[model samples]
Target: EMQLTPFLILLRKTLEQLQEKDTGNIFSEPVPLSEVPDYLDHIKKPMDFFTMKQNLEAYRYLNFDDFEEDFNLIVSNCLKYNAKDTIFYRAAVRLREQGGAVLRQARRQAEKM
Candidate 1:
């Protein structure tokens, strides 16, 4: 089981930004376009950028009604763009590890009761 701290960190940051009263379009957020290829080239394992892209799509759709369809398209684009990113794969692995750790902790805590 791995710690999902990294994923949690990203989630928390995103949530914090979204919770702002002035939160505007998600498109305003920063994306590493120029560095994307370099980023993808670094992936070292079998990855699932599709799922990650889907989650981002969900977030985008959740935030904007009119952009729902567009966000889905963006999600697909993200998947296509990061299909080979090592960072994406590594992040996914870390996310799974974190889930495993949380589950193990929950089971242990439950067993104590």
Candidate 2:
């Protein structure tokens, strides 16, 4: 079963906030991922990264073709306005990275299907 862990939920919430901001003004380009805080990486595992990427990809492949479009739009908008906004960009990077982790966990758990 898929689960939205606390990290995932916070990531989603941050994404929602970013999107909401997009409705008003675009964000600028993101800072280098390396420059971002390492809090999200605290939970990293190689297998988990693979799993998260696969899980998110599978959901897009099996459920909706437009998923990437929406995701890209959010990223694009953020880059447009707040590219230099270090705090928000760092937060966004953490959220995206953690979201990947969560997705990976979901995929690993779903192999029983």
Off by over 4 Å in 1: 1-84
Worst 10 residues of 1 by lDDT: 18-27
Task: At residue 25, give the lDDT of candidate 2.
Answer: 28
Each candidate: what lDDT?
Answer: 0.37, 0.39
TM-score of each: 0.25, 0.33
lDDT, candidate 2, at 39: 26
Model 2 off-target regions past 4 Å?
1-80
RMSD of 1: 13.4
Task: Choose the strongest candidate by lDDT.
Answer: 2
lDDT of 1 by residue, 1-113 (tens): 33444434443443333223212222233345475555445333222223334455455322222222332333334344454565544433443344344434433533343
Minimum summed lDDT over a 10-residue window in model 2 is located at 43-52
Per-prediction RMSD in angstroms?
13.4, 12.8
Q: C-alpha displacement of 67 in model 1, angstroms?
A: 29
